[PDB]
Amino acid sequence: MKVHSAIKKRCEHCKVVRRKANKRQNGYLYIICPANPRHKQRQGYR
Partner RNA sequence: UAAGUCGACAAGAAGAUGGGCUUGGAAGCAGCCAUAAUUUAAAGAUCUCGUAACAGAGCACUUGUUAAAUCUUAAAAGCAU
Enumerate residues 1-46 that contact Zn ion by CB under 5 A: 11, 13-14, 33, 36, 39
Contact flag: residue 22 with RNA (CB under 7 A): no
Q: How many residues bind RNA (CB under 7 A)?
A: 2
What phi, psi does 16 have (nearest 5°)? -100, 115
Contact footprint for Zn ion (CB under 5 A): 11, 13-14, 33, 36, 39
Contact footprint for RNA (CB under 7 A): 26, 29
